[PDB]
Design a protein around this motif. Structure first.
Motif, PDB file in Angstrom:
ATOM      1  N   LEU A  44      32.511  42.967  37.310  1.00 46.31           N
ATOM      2  CA  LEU A  44      32.810  44.016  38.273  1.00 46.31           C
ATOM      3  C   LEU A  44      32.314  43.587  39.643  1.00 46.31           C
ATOM      4  CD1 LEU A  44      33.940  46.879  38.755  1.00 46.31           C
ATOM      5  CD2 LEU A  44      31.631  47.753  38.338  1.00 46.31           C
ATOM      6  N   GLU A  45      33.164  43.748  40.656  1.00 44.81           N
ATOM      7  CA  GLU A  45      32.819  43.390  42.024  1.00 44.81           C
ATOM      8  C   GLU A  45      33.329  44.473  42.963  1.00 44.81           C
ATOM      9  OE1 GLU A  45      34.323  39.632  43.293  1.00 44.81           O
ATOM     10  OE2 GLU A  45      33.354  39.706  45.262  1.00 44.81           O
ATOM     11  N   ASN A  46      32.453  44.954  43.841  1.00 45.34           N
ATOM     12  CA  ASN A  46      32.798  45.996  44.796  1.00 45.34           C
ATOM     13  C   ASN A  46      32.128  45.687  46.125  1.00 45.34           C
ATOM     14  OD1 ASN A  46      33.748  48.286  46.020  1.00 45.34           O
ATOM     15  ND2 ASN A  46      32.642  49.743  44.717  1.00 45.34           N
ATOM     16  N   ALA A  47      32.905  45.728  47.203  1.00 44.63           N
ATOM     17  CA  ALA A  47      32.389  45.449  48.537  1.00 44.63           C
ATOM     18  C   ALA A  47      32.987  46.436  49.524  1.00 44.63           C
ATOM     19  CB  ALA A  47      32.701  44.011  48.965  1.00 44.63           C
TER      20      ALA A  47
ATOM     21  N   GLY B  25      42.331  38.565  27.236  1.00 43.12           N
ATOM     22  CA  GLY B  25      41.700  38.484  28.538  1.00 43.12           C
ATOM     23  C   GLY B  25      42.405  39.324  29.584  1.00 43.12           C
ATOM     24  N   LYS B  26      41.640  40.080  30.369  1.00 48.95           N
ATOM     25  CA  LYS B  26      42.196  40.964  31.385  1.00 48.95           C
ATOM     26  C   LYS B  26      41.418  40.801  32.683  1.00 48.95           C
ATOM     27  CE  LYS B  26      43.474  45.786  32.300  1.00 48.95           C
ATOM     28  NZ  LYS B  26      43.482  47.177  31.767  1.00 48.95           N
ATOM     29  N   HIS B  27      42.143  40.698  33.796  1.00 49.60           N
ATOM     30  CA  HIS B  27      41.542  40.577  35.116  1.00 49.60           C
ATOM     31  C   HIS B  27      42.282  41.490  36.082  1.00 49.60           C
ATOM     32  CE1 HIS B  27      39.299  38.770  38.422  1.00 49.60           C
ATOM     33  NE2 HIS B  27      40.438  38.622  39.074  1.00 49.60           N
ATOM     34  N   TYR B  28      41.525  42.209  36.908  1.00 50.09           N
ATOM     35  CA  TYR B  28      42.094  43.160  37.854  1.00 50.09           C
ATOM     36  C   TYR B  28      41.371  43.042  39.187  1.00 50.09           C
ATOM     37  CZ  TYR B  28      43.763  47.543  39.896  1.00 50.09           C
ATOM     38  OH  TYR B  28      44.330  48.487  40.718  1.00 50.09           O
ATOM     39  N   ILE B  29      42.137  43.000  40.272  1.00 50.59           N
ATOM     40  CA  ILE B  29      41.588  42.900  41.619  1.00 50.59           C
ATOM     41  C   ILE B  29      42.375  43.831  42.531  1.00 50.59           C
ATOM     42  CG2 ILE B  29      43.045  40.956  42.325  1.00 50.59           C
ATOM     43  CD1 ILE B  29      40.519  39.888  43.835  1.00 50.59           C
TER      44      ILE B  29
END
Ligand SMILES: *[C@@H]1O[C@H](CO)[C@@H](O[C@@H]2O[C@H](CO)[C@@H](O[C@@H]3O[C@H](CO)[C@@H](O)[C@H](O)[C@@H]3O)[C@H](O)[C@H]2NC(C)=O)[C@H](O)[C@H]1NC(C)=O
Lengths: 49, 49
Positions: A44-47, B25-29
């Protein structure tokens, strides 16, 4: 000879910076009567600026 | 990720084996950025001669 001057200068600057980073990884393996494998990953990344 | 395997044999022979593999595998941006700047003034020069 009269004069009348007035100067009111104002300057405001505000900056906010926030960053959040979270990562989790889990793995499980069991081999005996039967082979078993488990894997888990979370990121998890939040900026905010 | 998940995996399961089983093996059992007994001669009177006999053979038996299980093999399984599962991967996911799952990726979300996502990003949203906004920038706004506004300025508005006037200059009402009035002179009486
Ligand atoms: C999340 O944060 C990262 C890191 O700050 C952002 O990455 C930045 O992406 C831009 C896109 O090209 C990179 O180029 C820059 O573009 C701006 C115009 O938008 C330009 O004025 C700069 O001179 C530069 O060329 C930028 O280098 C890169 N940041 C870093 C530190 O490398 C990303 O954009 C952010 N996410 C979202 C959705 O905006």
């Amino acid at each position: 000879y009269r004069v009348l001057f007035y100067v009111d200068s104002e300057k405001l600057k505000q900056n906010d910076f926030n960053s959040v980073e979270e990562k989790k990884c889990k793995s499980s393996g069991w081999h005996f009567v039967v082979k078993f494998s488990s894997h888990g990953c979370k990121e998890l990344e939040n900026a905010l600026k | 990720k998940s995996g399961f395997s089983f093996g059992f044999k007994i001669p009177g022979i006999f053979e038996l084996g299980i093999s399984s593999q599962s991967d996911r595998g799952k990726h979300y941006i996502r990003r949203t950025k906004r920038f706004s700047h506004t300025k508005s003034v006037f200059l009402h020069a009035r002179s009486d001669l």
